[PDB]
């Protein structure tokens, strides 16, 4: 099903078929600027993630930390910093619970949050 999930995400988005390596890691490019990495991470779950560029200056820190609470809902977007101090955003999702169209939805959220930090 991780591969059936990518089979369907590719459909709800007419794209050739997402090439994965041996760790099922794949990537998609968005508005030509954003690379979203997709990867199974456990037996039950995948990660979608991406690089978004530098920390404003400071104190978007508090604002993310103030929103880094738990949620009843899937697809929440989380932010970390890079070794080299770029925002990294990601979401982790139950692979069986997640339709191809939920995934596209997470990615849009991913790319919204980056636009806003960047």
């Amino acid at each position: 099903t991780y591969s059936s999930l990518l089979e369907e995400f590719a459909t709800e988005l007419g794209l050739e078929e997402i090439e994965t390596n041996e760790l099922g890691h794949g990537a998609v490019t968005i508005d030509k600027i954003w690379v979203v990495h997709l990867a199974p991470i456990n037996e039950k779950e995948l990660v979608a993630f991406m690089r978004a560029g530098i920390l404003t200056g400071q104190s978007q820190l508090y604002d993310i930390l103030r929103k880094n609470l738990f949620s009843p809902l899937s697809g929440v977007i989380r932010c970390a910093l890079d070794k080299d101090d770029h925002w990294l955003l990601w979401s982790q999702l139950n692979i069986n619970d997640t339709s191809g169209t939920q995934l596209a939805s997470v990615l849009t959220s991913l790319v919204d949050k980056a636009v806003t930090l960047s």
């Binding site: 988005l13 390596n21 890691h25 990537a27 998609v28 490019t29 990495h37 990294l88 790319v111």
Partner: peptide, 20 residues
């Protein structure tokens, strides 16, 4: 979601975040 399929120096930045 608006655009489509590829990658470059992240099978580096990726390959790695995938353990960090």
């Amino acid at each position: 979601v608006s655009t489509q399929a590829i990658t470059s120096d992240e099978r580096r930045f990726a390959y790695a975040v995938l353990e960090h």
